[PDB]
Each structure stands twice: as C-alpha cells, then as structure tokens.
Ligand binder design. Sequence first.
Ligand code: FAD
Ligand code: FAD
Ligand code: NAP
Ligand code: NAP
Ligand code: FMN
Ligand code: FMN
Ligand code: SO3
Ligand code: SO3
Lengths: 630, 616
Amino acid sequence: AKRVKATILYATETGKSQAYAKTLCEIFKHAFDAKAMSMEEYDIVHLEHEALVLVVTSTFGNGDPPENGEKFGCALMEMRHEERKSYKVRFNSVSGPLANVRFSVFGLGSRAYPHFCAFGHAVDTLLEELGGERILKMREGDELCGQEEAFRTWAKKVFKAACDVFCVGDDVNIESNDRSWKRNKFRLTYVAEAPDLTQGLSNVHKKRVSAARLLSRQNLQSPKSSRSTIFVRLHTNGNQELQYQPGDHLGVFPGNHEDLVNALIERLEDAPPANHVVKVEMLEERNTALGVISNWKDESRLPPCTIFQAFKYYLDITTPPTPLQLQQFASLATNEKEKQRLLVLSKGLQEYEEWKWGKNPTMVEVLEEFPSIQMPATLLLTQLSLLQPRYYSISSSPDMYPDEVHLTVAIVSYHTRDGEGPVHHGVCSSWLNRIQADDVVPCFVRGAPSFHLPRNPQVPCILVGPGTGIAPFRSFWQQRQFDIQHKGMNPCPMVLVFGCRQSKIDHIYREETLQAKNKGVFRELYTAYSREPDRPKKYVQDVLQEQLAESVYRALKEQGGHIYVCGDVTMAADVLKAIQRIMTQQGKLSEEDAGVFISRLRDDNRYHEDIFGVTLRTYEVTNRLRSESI
Amino acid sequence: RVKATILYATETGKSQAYAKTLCEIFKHAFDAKAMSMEEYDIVHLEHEALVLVVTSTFGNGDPPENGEKFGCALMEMRSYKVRFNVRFSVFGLGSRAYPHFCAFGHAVDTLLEELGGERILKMREGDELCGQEEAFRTWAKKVFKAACDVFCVGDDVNIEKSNDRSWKRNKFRLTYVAEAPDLTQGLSNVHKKRVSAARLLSRQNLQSPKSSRSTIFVRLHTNGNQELQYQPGDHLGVFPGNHEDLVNALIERLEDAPPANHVVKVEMLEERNTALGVISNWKDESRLPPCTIFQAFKYYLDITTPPTPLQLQQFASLATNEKEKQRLLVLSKGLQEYEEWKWGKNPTMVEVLEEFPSIQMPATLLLTQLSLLQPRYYSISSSPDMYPDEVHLTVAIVSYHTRDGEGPVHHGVCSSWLNRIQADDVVPCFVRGAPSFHLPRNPQVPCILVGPGTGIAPFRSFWQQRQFDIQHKGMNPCPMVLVFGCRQSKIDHIYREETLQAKNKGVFRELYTAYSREPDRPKKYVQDVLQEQLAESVYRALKEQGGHIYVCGDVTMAADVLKAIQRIMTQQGKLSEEDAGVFISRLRDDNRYHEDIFGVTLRTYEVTNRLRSESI
Ligand SMILES: Cc1cc2nc3c(=O)[nH]c(=O)nc-3n(C[C@H](O)[C@H](O)[C@H](O)COP(=O)(O)OP(=O)(O)OC[C@H]3O[C@@H](n4cnc5c(N)ncnc54)[C@H](O)[C@@H]3O)c2cc1C
Ligand SMILES: Cc1cc2nc3c(=O)[nH]c(=O)nc-3n(C[C@H](O)[C@H](O)[C@H](O)COP(=O)(O)OP(=O)(O)OC[C@H]3O[C@@H](n4cnc5c(N)ncnc54)[C@H](O)[C@@H]3O)c2cc1C
Ligand SMILES: NC(=O)c1ccc[n+]([C@@H]2O[C@H](COP(=O)([O-])OP(=O)(O)OC[C@H]3O[C@@H](n4cnc5c(N)ncnc54)[C@H](OP(=O)(O)O)[C@@H]3O)[C@@H](O)[C@H]2O)c1
Ligand SMILES: NC(=O)c1ccc[n+]([C@@H]2O[C@H](COP(=O)([O-])OP(=O)(O)OC[C@H]3O[C@@H](n4cnc5c(N)ncnc54)[C@H](OP(=O)(O)O)[C@@H]3O)[C@@H](O)[C@H]2O)c1
Ligand SMILES: Cc1cc2nc3c(=O)[nH]c(=O)nc-3n(C[C@H](O)[C@H](O)[C@H](O)COP(=O)(O)O)c2cc1C
Ligand SMILES: Cc1cc2nc3c(=O)[nH]c(=O)nc-3n(C[C@H](O)[C@H](O)[C@H](O)COP(=O)(O)O)c2cc1C
Ligand SMILES: O=S([O-])[O-]
Ligand SMILES: O=S([O-])[O-]
C-alpha cells in the first residue's frame, strides 16, 4: 500500500477543466501515483476503494453538470439517495459508502451566472455526505477573473495538504515544466492518408459528426440595421443521425477564416508548406523495471492532415492565450523588454487580465505584438486548444420540414480595445455567414429533453425570449401549426413574449409569427422594444410584469401551464424574478411561497430554461462583473 | 505501383475481414488500401485508378448502415427499391435466404458503371449459407490476376497468396495497466458510437408458463439520457455479456498466463525495415480497451460464433497431435468438410478447443483474432409519449440443441443475457432510427400492421402512440388493422389483452390472428389471413385510401406476405404479375409499404437447411 494512488476526475465542455486536471496530475506525479480521467471514462465501481480523489469540473447550461459529467453526478446523487431534495433544489436554488476516501474539489464557472460553480459544489457536497473526508475546502475558479491563477494556488495547497495527510512528500520538493512543450519531444511526420473532415472530427471529439448541407441563408433584419441575424437552411440528407425534436440544439463545427489561418502559418519558423498530410508523433519516455523505455508514438489528438486544415478545422486560434501558454511563448522571445512583458503576463494577475480583456488578442495578434517570438509549428499544433463546436437552437419543425434543419444566427462582430481596436468576428457565426453551398457543414444533434413542448397539448405555454432567444420557439409554433392543420388537433394557443431593439429593424420573424397567430397557434404576441426613439426601454421582464401578470398567474396557478425562457443568462435570471414577483404580488405569497412555487414548477418540468450563456450587453456585463468581483 | 482502393461495407464485420485480406494480396502488385465507404471522400472516387468493393447487404436489400452515404451518392451522382430489390469489381456478401440477394453489391456494381467506370471482373456473390469464404478466395485470386494484367505488371510474385496480418508470436504482448474504462465508455471506444448506460426496470414472461418456448417483456430506464431519444418504429442496439461459465471455461483452457482479475492491454510490435535490420517500437493495438481478460471475453469478444476458415488454419499450427492438426487443415479450407462441421455442430470457441484438446492456445491470439461481440438489435416496443424515459423490448428467448436437437443446448447470447441480468444491472445500448418504419405523417390514412410472434414488437409502440394521440393529444386517426400470428391462442398470444384494449379505444378497427399450432383448426399463417379475410380492405387501402402496410419479422414471412399482397392485387383489381408487382415497387419507394426484417428467425433449422440444399 505504498505509492498512494491519486485519482483525478474531471468534467469539461470546452477543455479548461481537462487542461488544469492534466497540470494537476503532473504535479501529483511527484509524490503520488496519479491518473487523470474524464468522469465518464471512470468506472464508479472503484470510488469506494479510492484513497484520494481530486475533482476539477466546470458547470454548464443552467447550473448543470458538463455533459460528460452527468453520469457521474447522477451516480453519486443515487448512492446517496427515506426520500427528498432534487439537484435543482439544493444546488441551483431560488435564494458512509465513501468513509475510506479523501477528496478535494476545484470548480470552474463564472460570476455572470446565477449558480456559480454549481456542479463543483454538488460533487463537493455529495462526496462528503457519502462519507468522504474533504482535504481542502472547495475552491472556485472564475472565468471572469483569475481562473488559471486560482488554480495554481489551490493546486499548490491541495498537493501540500495531501502529502501531509498521507505522510508522503518528504522527498517531493518545493517547486513551464511538464508535457508542455520541448523541441526534442514533438515531431510532425509525413502521412499519405488524410481522413474526411466529418470523420476526422468524429475521432477528435469522440462522437459521430454528420455532414449537413447548406441550402440557403437570408437576412432577418432590415438592410438598414447595423446588426445582422441570419436564417440558415440545411439539408440533413435523410441521415438518421440528424433526427430531432423541437427544442433540441444543433452543434456546429466551424472553420477559422482562411486569411487568419494563413497569417498565422506565415508566421511559423519551421513549418512545412501549409499543405502536407502530417501526423504528429511524440517522443514518449515510458519507465520500466529495466530502467527507462523511450520511443516515438502518435500524439493521437488531431487526425492526419495538412497544418492548414489543422489550424482551420481543429484548433482554436482566436481564444487569448492562457498564462501557461504565455510562459512557453516567453522562452521563445529574443528581446529583453519584449520577453519580460511576456513573463509579466504569464502571471494571470492584473496585467494579464487587462491585456486579455482589453485586447482580446488572437494567436496571430500575439505573435505580431511580440515579433521576436520563434514559433515552432509543433508548439501550436500541440498546445492550442481544439476548435469547439457551437450550439444553435433548431428553428424548424421536423414534420413541417423533413430532412431540413433551420437556424437563427446572430452575427457576432465587434471592435477590440473598447471600440478603438480592429474588428473581431465570431468564429462560427461569421463562418455560417459566408460558407458556400458546396461547403460541408459538420454538425450533430444534441437533444434538449428539458426544453421540449409539453406532452399535453391542452395546457397553456408562455414562450419568453429576446433576440435570437426566439430560435427554438420557431420550431414550437411551426410544430403546433402543423398539428392543427394536418393532425387534426386543437392545442391550447400559446403566448409569445419577444424582445428586440427597433420595430422595423430587429423584429425578426415578425410576419411569420403574425401568420401563426391568425392560424390559432398563438393567443397574443407581446413585444418589448429597447432602442425605440419613440418610447422608453422595455425588456421582456417588463412586458411580463406590466401586461401578463394575470395571464402568467392564471396559466401557471390554475391551468397547469408552462413557461419557457430562452436566451442570454442575464435576461433569464431577470425573468425569474419578474415571475417570482408576479406570483407574490398576485397571490399574496412571500418571497417564500413564490420561490417554492417556482422551485416546484422546475421540479415538475413546467418551468423551462435554455441558456445561451452571456450574449446580451457582453461588454458592459463582463465589465461590471469583472471589476466588481476582484 | 498503381493505387488500389478497396472500399468495404459491413455490419457483423465479415466484409471487413475480407477486404483486409484482399488488401494483403493486392499489396503484391499494387499500392492497396482499405477503409469503409464512410471513412472516405466520395469526391476522390473519380480520381481513382482502381476501386475494389467488398460489401454485405442488410435490412431487406438495404445497404448496411455504414454503406448508406455511398449508396445514395452513386444514385444521385448517376428508385433503389425499384431497381435493386476508374476500374473496379465488386464482391457482395449475402444470403440466399433473403429475396434481394446481395442487393447492395449488385446496386453498387450497376451504378459504378454509370459513373465513368469500367468493370474488371464479373461481380461475385458470397452466400453465407453455402461456400462464402470459398467464392471469396476464388474471386479474390481471379480479380487479382485480372487487374494485374489490366494494369499491365508482368511476371511478379503471383504465388504468395495464412497471411502477414495473421497472429505470430512476438508481434503481440499483454502489458498491465491500472486504469480500465467503464464498460459503456469502453464500448463507445471500440465501436466508435455513443453507447449509453440504461438500467433494467423489469422483465416478465408474455408466454404462458405452460409454454415450452418463452418471450419476455423488458423495461429499461433511460435515465433522462438525450442520447436515447427515439420514435415509434426505431431499434435499440444492445451489447450483452457472454455467460460466465463459458467465459471461465475458455480462460481455464488458455495457455497464456494473464490472471483473469488484472487489467491489461494489447501492444503490438510495429517494425519498419531498414538496410541492416529494423527500426521498431511497441504500439498499442488499440482495438479493445484496457480491461481484465475476463471482461474482454465476457463483454467485448465473440466467443460463440464458429471459427472462420482463416482462424482455423491458425489453430492448426498450434495442435500437438497429427490427426487433430490435420482435421484442422481439412476444415481450414471452407469446403464441404468445414461447412458440414460448422452448420451441424455450430461449435463455440470452447467446444472447438475441446474437440481438439492438443491445441495450445495463447491468450493474445484469441484477444486479437476473435471477432468483436456485436450488439443485437431490438424493435422498441414503447411509445416515448406514453412511457417517458423508458424503453421496452419484446424479446424471444433463443435456445436450441446442436446436431439437429441431439447435441448440447446452445443459448442465444443477448436473448439469454437479457433473461438473467438483475434489476439495475447496466444495459449498454444505443438507438438506431428506422426512418422507413415510422408511422405516417398523415394520421388520417389506414395502416395495416402484419407480423407474427416478436414481429409484433414495433406495433406495440405504434398502438401506444396512437392511443396517446387519442387520449391526450385529442386527435382522431384513421383506425388500424392488426394481422398477428402465433402458435396457440392460449400460449403464444403475447399482448392479447393490450391489443384488445387498443381496439376498445379506437386505435384498432379490427384484430386478425392466425394460429399455426392450434391442435383444432389448420395451420394458418398471416399471409393466409390477408387473402382469406382482408383481401378487399388491403386492395382499397393500397389503391384508393392512400394506405400503408407494415410488415415486420422473419424474412421468409415478409416474403410470403409480399408475394401474397401482390396477388391480392391481381385477383381483386385485375392486373398482371408485372403490373401489380411493380405497383408494390412504387409503394416501397413512395414509402407506403414498410418492411422490417429481423433476419432468419423462424423455422431456422428447416428453412436454412432446404436452402443449403437449394444451392448445393
Ligand atoms: C444551448 C445553446 C444554444 C444556443 N443557441 C444559439 C442560437 O440559437 N442562435 C445564436 O445565434 N446563438 C446561440 N448560442 C450562442 C452560440 O453558440 C455562439 O456562442 C455564438 O454564435 C458565438 O459564437 P462565435 O462562434 O461566433 O464567436 P466566438 O468566437 O466564440 O466568440 C464569442 C466570444 O466573444 C467575446 N465577444 C462577443 N462580443 C463581444 C463584445 N461586444 N466585446 C468584446 N469581446 C466580445 C466573448 O468573450 C465571447 O465569449 C447558444 C449557446 C448555447 C450554449
Ligand atoms: C432490426 C432488427 C430488429 C430485431 N428486433 C427483434 C425484436 O424485437 N425481438 C426479438 O426477440 N428479436 C429481434 N431481432 C433478432 C435479434 O436481434 C437477435 O438476432 C436475437 O435476439 C438472437 O440473438 P441472440 O443474441 O440471443 O443469439 P445469437 O446468439 O446470435 O444466436 C442466433 C444464431 O443461432 C443459430 N441458431 C438459433 N436457432 C437455431 C436453431 N433452432 N437451430 C440451429 N442453429 C440455431 C443461428 O445461426 C443464429 O444466427 C431483430 C434483428 C434485427 C436485425
Ligand atoms: N456590439 C456589437 O457590435 C455586436 C455585434 C454582433 C453581435 N453582438 C452581440 O451578439 C448578440 C446577438 O444579438 P441578439 O439578436 O440575440 O440580441 P440583441 O439585439 O443584442 O438584444 C436582444 C434584445 O433583448 C434586450 N435585452 C438586453 N439585455 C436584456 C436583459 N438583461 N434582460 C432582458 N432583455 C434584455 C436587448 O435590449 P438592448 O436595447 O438593451 O440591447 C434587445 O432589445 C447581441 O445581443 C450582442 O450582445 C454585439
Ligand atoms: N426451433 C425452436 O425450437 C425454437 C425455440 C425457441 C425459440 N426459437 C426461435 O426464437 C424465435 C422467437 O419466436 P417468435 O415469438 O418470434 O415466433 P415463433 O414462435 O417462432 O413463430 C411466429 C409465428 O409465425 C409463424 N410463421 C412461421 N414461419 C412463417 C413464415 N415463413 N411466414 C409467415 N408466418 C410464419 C409460425 O408458425 P409455425 O408454427 O409454422 O412455426 C408462428 O405461428 C422463434 O420463432 C425461433 O426462431 C426456436
Ligand atoms: C452556455 C454556458 C452555460 C454556463 N453555465 C454556468 C453556470 O451555471 N455556472 C457557472 O458557475 N459557470 C457557467 N459557465 C461558465 C463555465 O463554467 C466556465 O466558462 C468554464 O470556464 C468552462 O470550463 P470548461 O472549459 O472546463 O467546461 C457557462 C458557460 C457557457 C458557455
Ligand atoms: C437483418 C439481416 C438482414 C439481411 N439482409 C440481406 C439481404 O437483403 N441480402 C443478402 O444478400 N444478405 C442479407 N443478409 C446477410 C448478410 O449480408 C450476410 O450475413 C453477410 O455475411 C454479413 O456480412 P458483414 O458481416 O460483413 O456485414 C442479412 C443479415 C441480417 C442479420
Ligand atoms: O500594441 S500592439 O497590438 O501593437
Ligand atoms: O452474466 S450476468 O449474470 O451478469
């Protein structure tokens, strides 16, 4: 029972928890026999016999487990569950089998969301009730301020605390450094077989990606708008992989703009032409009883391909470097002043914060700001993060549009340095806005069972969502419309609470919702204008408290109706207060009965929320929170 | 060298094996490669010099799943059901027990031509029931020489054709690992598809206790798993566990030393020749995940399917006797001797090692040469609207005696596993849509549901759905007709009270049952109820009412039914066997005549024999 095993479990949606977990395993390799596994890869049957367990997990959606964390969270939730309390009740709330085990939790999250680091807190809370002995109190990493930084602190303490408790680490010492990057470690070797895009992305992200097809794209806003929102039609080609129900999302895999990809490639020192199928092989120095066995292997992260296809379809080249990545960049800088700035930023303290949040630098902008960096083709290919797919609410009814998938996409573009800097185009939205019909569209369907229309047609539904948060409601109404016209049903009509900036500029799908109302689908259509010169600023929160307070109340309290909120997390949080008020001031219930009534609706799946994350007033919201919390 | 792309389609993995071997032969005179019709750009096709196609046919003449993309691509680039139900040559695996024999291979062969394609050799067929591996080896040599001269290489090593990718003794080793994945995750890695962990809620027999046979009702909980969303008509792919006794008998007969409780992995020696030796390293085989050998045999590997001729030859060089090593050699040549052996005894791997006890079996040969345990498909018997977060299955428990009922009992792998797993045990499975076996979008048209025994399975979701659209969505769909079939009304009438009830609620207009072993009345099949009781309701539906007819179950039955309806078209409406037969062709492409083939599930022994006798 020597060489204590340290099991590092992680859950992630974009790769941050996974990275930190790797870094954490590397550290524990010093005094312990450590392993880093995704929560889904791990077999819950070993847990009770685990000596030490370290959890690094983010939280997603509406205070939920990352998708690859759901199974593990249910499992715990199960072993621990005499009856009561739901996950949504205790951990995302409105205001022993593991005796042998020692653990500690680090959770990633954002103060921009209601239930900050919810999944980390549930796991942390749950391992303790199951009989586990917590080493360090749970620490939280805020994506808005010092996330990578707070990881180090905790990583340091927890290691020290583990060494102390297990009484090992009298030979491990006070301390880049690991599988980071080193020139005699990674090598790009030639290959003659380059997979197909959708097949390569399936390997890379361990899931089946189907090739969809672009049929058309149209502007949903006036040509006189400064903004742009596009209606996109895709042909699924029969593929049963792409079956969906109204409410579900489509995950899409973009391509970085070629110019940016090229600028980047033309800045590498030693790099084959940006065209030669090259696999990446790494010098892996294993270790045996004989001594140390060293040899070449396949990194096996990216599939065989040209560096161009790699930077274009598989690697994140626009997300600002983490402090770690800057550290590897620094040791490549050949200019005194130019290299110290790199080391100052490597800290993740304020300078980093200001630089990142101020310049929102792409990989290219960084190499160009510190032109004395000798960038190795293999450092990027192995250190950059994978290009993540972006999710989009499906905007079509599969009955009204068989073998078709529609999307409503806000075109993200903004100026850096608070309007002074150049333009940065969102990766997926700008891609979806320029692909041609011959272009393949890598995607998959991710069902959203908490956001499907009710099984019972005769109950009232209130659909709340500003801007593109209307996207899924378009599948709701098209679907209800088809039901009426062809299935011979008379479902209780619904109410739509939309919200935008200007009557004849932003009200997307206006006529389309009109036509749907005349057909019985909707009882009434409410709209909140926020930048109308002719009146005051109104938000769906307002339309709800000023013109539906009664309907809302009668719908939810007597008619057994449902309310659906979709879009920006700030709005959704506001809509939850507007409803808590309407419930209080329209039924005489304190912040108690109103809160518990809501908390009940959710419980019974009658209060639905589909969070897009932070999409509205991004600058002002991120700015307020960033500051206010440091 | 010329580049030869060998494209293969496969479900149970036989065509895959054939292509990899085909690749090892074409290596001699060509630059040959092998991959799925999915792991390939259909755009590169036209820029190919030589394309070899090895593909099986599934469904009812349908392309295997991984051969769906490719199929329609050649179709548009150049309906399917109608017609079939660069240099290149096709070899299609199949079975003469199915109507549209090698339908996919014959379709791909036809369409390649219609795309600037020149055929080398006449497309061959490989009947799973008689001389499959035999016709392949042949066509294999005949097409090699054929392309060899077509592309003009002269006198080269045309005698080399037991090859290289075949197990040797220091090309493989089992290195310990202290971290083995969870089963469902391991399976997702092995089969490259998302497999979810579902849990058993309950199982109950739907046949009378006084029955000799047995069918079970199975309820699984999806656990809110979005990956497990389905529609009535869809199938659930399930991964079972082999029985422990057979797993431990197999381990205890093993030569290699791996304790069974230790996690291991299979590394293979990757060597790259040089001018004075070789530059090499041990890479992970990476077919199976790290797991205990007990777990590989119980959950990842097929230890019951009879050894192929290729796997026997290998056992040959491992027998320490002479008769044994010789019988092995005889059987290694998939001919009369081997076919009689296999079909007659249908030996598990364990029985093979016991019929030939001098074989010294190393663990790394089984772990690398045995086929992957394939998942079994089951028609979902529940409506998702009626049973949220639930998946129900109707499962016939397969169990037969070898050597024509004279030998030991052999249990169906998945059916028997599903028949003994305990509540809450994990059930790895996934959902595979059947877009061609879904209820019509128009619920105001009549549907005629035909299917005996377990063939009823998808209809229980059809009628639970309709019952739900009625009792809850407030719609009034055109009532349906159920044409069922079983052995004895008092024994085999599974879900009798349920279909009965579905009638009382307006789901079903009428319920027609056919019995085949009622010791009173004659042996009536469902094809006999169509003609002898509804020949008119069927004609009016498929001709005037814009109706739909769904056929589900054994391929033989489904065929007797097609040939029946085609006549009900002649007789009742007056059109010839080419005017009614092609009208059903228009039905199957208009998607109003639905078929869902389970394979050969009925009268297996009787049927598959006459068929061996058919071709032989
Ligand atoms: C379940 C779900 C459903 C969704 N459905 C939809 C949908 O239906 N329709 C839709 O349009 N979107 C939807 N989204 C949002 C969407 O997926 C993408 O986040 C969005 O299109 C932007 O992606 P991008 O790839 O274009 O830009 P990305 O390049 O990734 O860039 C966005 C990042 O830009 C920064 N950026 C943006 N604005 C500014 C600014 N003003 N100032 C400084 N920096 C800024 C932020 O740091 C932000 O994270 C959904 C998200 C989720 C999780
Ligand atoms: C789309 C689809 C849907 C299906 N739906 C269902 C369903 O809903 N319900 C259901 O019960 N089944 C269904 N099946 C059949 C099912 O999937 C399995 O084939 C079946 O349960 C048996 O699997 P097993 O794994 O138990 O036996 P397996 O071990 O694979 O064994 C069967 C093999 O045994 C031989 N064997 C069987 N009987 C005999 C005999 N009498 N004499 C000599 N040799 C014999 C055959 O060679 C056969 O291949 C479906 C198949 C498909 C393709
Ligand atoms: N700044 C840029 O150049 C730029 C460019 C591309 C995309 N983007 C971003 O990408 C997003 C996509 O646009 P979109 O179509 O979804 O919507 P949008 O036009 O940004 O706004 C949606 C509507 O909801 C309102 N709203 C804002 N905050 C709210 C809150 N906290 N609670 C309730 N309602 C609220 C808005 O009011 P307001 O009048 O207050 O906005 C607006 O009327 C944009 O909203 C924007 O943040 C910005
Ligand atoms: N051979 C065995 O002893 C044995 C035992 C247990 C399970 N099994 C297998 O497991 C399967 C599951 O049983 P099941 O519930 O699906 O059904 P089943 O009991 O095998 O029979 C389904 C019904 O369909 C009839 N039928 C048979 N062949 C037909 C054809 N060619 N065309 C139209 N109708 C036909 C049968 O009549 P008949 O009376 O003419 O068969 C029977 O009444 C079995 O059918 C069988 O394959 C076999
Ligand atoms: C749609 C979306 C929903 C999110 N929901 C929450 C949330 O409820 N609580 C929280 O603390 N953070 C939330 N976040 C922030 C992530 O948890 C955080 O960005 C984290 O750094 C991502 O970590 P990962 O890369 O490991 O998955 C959310 C982010 C997105 C894009
Ligand atoms: C449900 C099912 C349906 C089948 N349908 C056909 C068919 O229409 N035509 C044919 O020639 N073979 C058919 N077969 C036989 C396969 O083509 C044959 O068993 C082949 O050996 C499987 O090869 P594979 O393992 O490479 O996919 C079918 C087999 C099953 C299990
Ligand atoms: O300051 S740099 O971006 O020129
Ligand atoms: O094989 S069953 O007992 O898990």
